[PDB]
Write a protein that binds this DNA or RNA. Structure first.
Ligand code: ATP
Ligand code: CA
Ligand code: CA
Ligand code: CA
Ligand code: CA
Ligand code: CA
Ligand code: CA
Length: 903
DNA sequence: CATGTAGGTAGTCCGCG
DNA sequence: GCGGACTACTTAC
């Protein structure tokens, strides 16, 4: 096989690399790497190295990496550019793997682990590590085994061995319900003292040294706890055995009363699954406990146990250990679904970076671009210092707040990257400037044509047309991968709707799910077979299709994020190719594009409807337009339609066969105007929205910029079995909004859009009557606990103290002295409830760590003093008032002359 | 050590015979 | 109590 790296580190003048050799064996090696950097030299000097602007360079080959670094400083002091890759391990990877890396994940040791630490005196701080580690579960991907390390004897209790037999039993039979598919994969190892456990864990670690290390919160808890605990018991050099190169760095972040730390283990790539999840999932959760996320992702129940976690080992060691095992498995289950490790490996090896550097788009792109330029013997520029400077972004249209009955939306495929490719925006493709007119003059095609030689953006920049830029070149590659995967995702989505339609008429038979590839639209033959399948087989197929869609979503959305990240990095001062001329060339072009195409669409629709000056585009944001299709429907007359699907078909066809071609013509004209390199503004129909035919539903509404709701029947070619709400910005989409209020607001919206005012009023009335019976957590608001200390004046709120921070302070006073109450952690999420006047907490609100029940000591009083009236008013009624006044209807029947009668 | 800007809601403060 | 500045939190792109 082809060789590929696992990890790379620079330590002094040595590169330390772990890799897979040609026989698929894991190897390690130390290399005294001899780096090169470069300097401009005179034209006369014949060379094979040129900078990206074609200026000749001379290679400086160094004896060691220290000399290279030293040289960079001397050049800085002289005042001359020091070119080349200054992150030497990227150069090493580039020299060592001068080819497209094909890696085999089965050779990569991916470790997933989690530890337990009984602590009777509060949270067990990793920096102090003063309590025994009494359980570790460590899953190894190469062995496919869960290695369980169980402490039987501790100063907090001596316990019996854990029973795998009881673990496998159903919880309703007193077992722990450890999933049956991992029972045979568990290797259980009890220990009579902690030192032997830890010694054996280290020996185990040596034999099975993680390459990728993950788990839930491992970076902020498990890893620093294990490191510091081993350090305190055996000494630091023993602790350093967690690094295959025996080197670590201890990052101490000053949390103030007290503190915590991150440990860097050289030769390992730590990918904390919480960080992967936050970067790659595109969710905004109110809690990030493993219980919450597992139930969200997997629909599995919360791990239930009686009493506090500090007493679980002593009271029920059996359950303690099972839950340690299960917690580790749940991360594997989430990853089986989401495939973030696979994505990390894909992206890492594509870029030729340390795998943990996928968290940094700047590092990722720096490596991609360096490797691309190196292949052509070109030399990358020195990184420079720049002051932070705000710059303009997208255009968002001010909508008229209203109900909007029939709406069709369109937007640009991969807008900013397409702009980069169309205009040819790169550091080395800049050809000059032109004198800019006001943007509106370009939008209305009255400004002079910027150039008939170069490709232009309305920010004043000109670019070469006849040569490739490294930015366009490399952004196109990732874009094309993105496009591939989104096709797979959308096919699986369409495939899923077919299955949902068939589930309306399941067959009474015993059969199996069809063996199909869900990434491709089902053939007619497959669809015929599906119409005869049973419910059981159909439901299994739907699950598989949805998993295929999620996998495709992970792959496409994050490659989208990567290329959009390249456009943004051009406006980040730490990016090697930072340049506001290029950043603003993109955003300014985008502003012109949206407003140009608004004009063109209004012109076109007026023409075909035989009218003049009517406004068809009602809204747009960055690269999208929203078109009122009311006059389109009225032209033919609603009477002509047989059902909802018929008018949907009609608008679908109208957009495809009439509008999109008019849009393409409009954009081709814009392209000629800017004399761009390549026409790539492809604005395809997104949503088709309206009320069901014959209903009193309003179809949709806008309250303002970035705030609207649409009843959608077709989305990017997916014709839904059941209409789906597209809601943006409204309170239903906000993690700060209480969970049950999101639900109730969404149902208010559904009724408004699908059923009408009377339906809304009926629901509003019921919810108002039943509000007070909802579970307290379900109606608590959520917020992030930032800068708590800043407003903490003697345990009381300082000036300008935010509401949520005030609630945290109230909480801290209420739990003072109580050692079991969980502390609010700086930066983390909290539930928040308002409190009636005169409450025993002595303030207007309370807040506690999210994803948890509030400690039993104060829970009773919180429940007793909750202010339901404030809560209903602020979280539900006030947002609903916004929706309904915008839509021009009432959530409560207004008084009128009719009130005089008895109906 | 290092993607971007645009934009709405709701909080505190402060003015207000 | 209500409604402007000033701003934290948060989401749409
Ligand atoms: N997270 C982000 N970081 C930087 N720029 C972004 C981000 N999200 C959106 N943008 C900018 O807004 C543009 C339009 O956003 P949009 O969500 O329509 O995605 P897109 O890149 O056009 O891809 P799609 O083909 O899925 O529409 C992007 O091309 C850019
Ligand atoms: Ca635990
Ligand atoms: Ca788009
Ligand atoms: Ca699209
Ligand atoms: Ca059937
Ligand atoms: Ca868009
Ligand atoms: Ca109490």
């Amino acid at each position: 096989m082809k060789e590929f790296y696992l990890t790379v580190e620079q330590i002094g003048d040595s590169i330390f690399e772990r890799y897979i050799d040609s026989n698929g064996r894991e190897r390690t090696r130390e290399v005294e790497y001899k780096p090169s950097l470069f300097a401009h030299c005179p034209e006369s000097q014949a060379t094979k190295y040129f900078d990206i602007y074609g200026k000749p360079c001379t290679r400086k080959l160094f004896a060691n990496m220290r000399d290279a670094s030293q040289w960079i400083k001397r050049m800085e002091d002289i005042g001359l550019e020091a070119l080349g890759m200054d992150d030497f391990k990227l150069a090493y990877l580039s020299d060592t793997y001068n080819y497209e890396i094909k890696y085999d994940h089965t050779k990569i040791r991916v470790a997933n682990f989690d530890i337990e630490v009984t602590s009777p005196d509060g949270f067990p701080e990793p920096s102090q590590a003063k309590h025994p580690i009494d359980a570790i579960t460590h899953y190894d991907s190469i062995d496919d085994r869960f290695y369980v390390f169980d402490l039987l004897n501790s100063p907090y209790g001596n316990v019996e061995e854990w029973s795998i037999e009881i673990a496998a039993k159903l919880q309703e039979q007193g077992g722990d319900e450890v999933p049956s598919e991992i029972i045979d994969k568990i290797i259980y190892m009890p220990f009579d003292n902690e030192k032997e456990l830890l010694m054996e864990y280290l020996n185990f670690w040596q034999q099975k040294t993680p390459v990728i290390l993950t788990g839930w919160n491992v970076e902020s808890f498990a890893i620093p706890y294990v490191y510091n605990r081993i350090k305190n018991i055996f000494g630091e050099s023993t602790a350093k055995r967690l690094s295959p190169h025996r080197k670590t760095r201890v990052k101490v972040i000053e949390n103030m009363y007290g503190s915590r730390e991150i440990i860097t283990l050289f030769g390992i790539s730590v990918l904390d699954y919480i960080d992967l999840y936050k970067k790659f999932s595109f969710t905004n959760q109110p809690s990030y406990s493993l219980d919450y996320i597992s139930e969200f992702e997997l629909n599995v129940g919360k791990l239930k146990y009686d009493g506090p976690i500090s007493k679980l080992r002593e009271s029920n060691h059996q359950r303690y250990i099972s839950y340690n095992i299960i917690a580790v498995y749940r991360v594997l289950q989430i990853d089986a679904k989401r495939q973030f490790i696979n994505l990390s490996l894909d992206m890492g090896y594509y870029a030729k970076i340390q795998i943990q550097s996928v968290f940094s788009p700047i590092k990722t792109w720096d490596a991609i671009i360096f490797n691309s330029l190196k292949e052509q013997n070109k030399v990358i520029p020195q990184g420079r210092s720049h002051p932070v400077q705000p710059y303009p972004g997208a255009f968002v249209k001010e909508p008229i707040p209203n109900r909007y009955k029939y709406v069709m939306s369109f937007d640009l495929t991969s807008a900013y990257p397409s702009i980069i490719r169309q205009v040819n925006i790169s550091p080395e493709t800049i050809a000059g400037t032109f004198k800019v007119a006001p943007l509106h003059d370009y939008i209305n095609a009255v400004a002079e044509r910027p150039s008939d030689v170069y490709s232009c953006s309305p920010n004043g920049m000109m670019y070469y047309k006849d040569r490739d830029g490294v930015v366009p070149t490399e952004i196109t590659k990732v874009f094309n991968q993105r496009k591939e995967h989104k096709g797979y995702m959308l096919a699986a989505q369409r495939n899923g709707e077919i299955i949902k339609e068939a589930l309306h008429n399941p067959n009474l038979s015993v059969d199996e799910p069809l063996d199909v590839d869900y990434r491709f639209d089902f053939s007619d033959e497959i669809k015929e077979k599906i119409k005869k399948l049973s419910a059981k087989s159909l439901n299994e197929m739907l699950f598989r299709a949805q998993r295929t869609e999620v996998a495709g979503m992970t792959a496409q959305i994050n490659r989208k994020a990567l290329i959009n990240g390249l456009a943004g990095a051009l406006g980040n001062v730490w990016f090697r190719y930072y340049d506001l001329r290029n950043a603003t060339a993109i955003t300014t072009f985008g502003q012109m594009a949206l407003q140009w195409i608004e004009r063109k669409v209004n012109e076109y629709l007026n023409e075909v409807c035989g009218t003049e000056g009517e406004a068809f585009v009602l809204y747009g944001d960055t690269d999208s337009i929203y078109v009122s299709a009311d006059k389109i429907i009225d032209k033919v007359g609603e009477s002509k339609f047989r059902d909802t699907n018929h008018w949907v078909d009609f608008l679908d066809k109208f957009a495809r066969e009439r509008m999109e071609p008019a849009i393409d013509r409009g954009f081709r004209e814009m392209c000629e105007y800017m004399n761009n390199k390549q026409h790539l503004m492809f604005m395809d129909r997104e949503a088709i929205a309206g009320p069901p035919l014959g209903s009193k539903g309003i179809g949709g509404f806008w309250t303002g910029k970035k705030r609207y709701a649409l009843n959608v029947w077709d989305m990017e070619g997916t014709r839904y079995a059941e209409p789906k709400l597209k809601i943006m910005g409204l309170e239903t989409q906000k993690s700060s909004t209480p969970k049950a209020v999101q639900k109730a607001l969404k149902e208010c919206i559904r009724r408004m859009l699908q059923e009408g005012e009377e339906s809304l009023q009926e629901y509003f009335k019921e919810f108002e009557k039943e509000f007070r019976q909802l579970n307290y957590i379900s109606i608590a608001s959520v917020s992030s606990a930032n800068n708590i200390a800043k407003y903490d004046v003697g345990g009381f709120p300082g000036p300008k103290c935010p509401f949520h921070i005030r609630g945290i302070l109230t909480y801290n006073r209420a739990i003072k002295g109580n050692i079991d109450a969980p502390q609010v952690v700086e930066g983390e999420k909290v539930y928040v409830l308002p409190l009636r006047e005169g409450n025993p907490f002595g303030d207007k609100c309370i807040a506690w760590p999210s994803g948890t029940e509030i400690t039993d000591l104060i829970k009773d009083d919180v429940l007793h003093w909750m202010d339901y009236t404030v809560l209903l008013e602020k979280t539900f009624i006030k947002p609903l008032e916004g929706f309904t006044s915008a839509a021009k209807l009432d959530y409560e029947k207004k008084a009128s002359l009719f009130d005089m009668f008895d109906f």
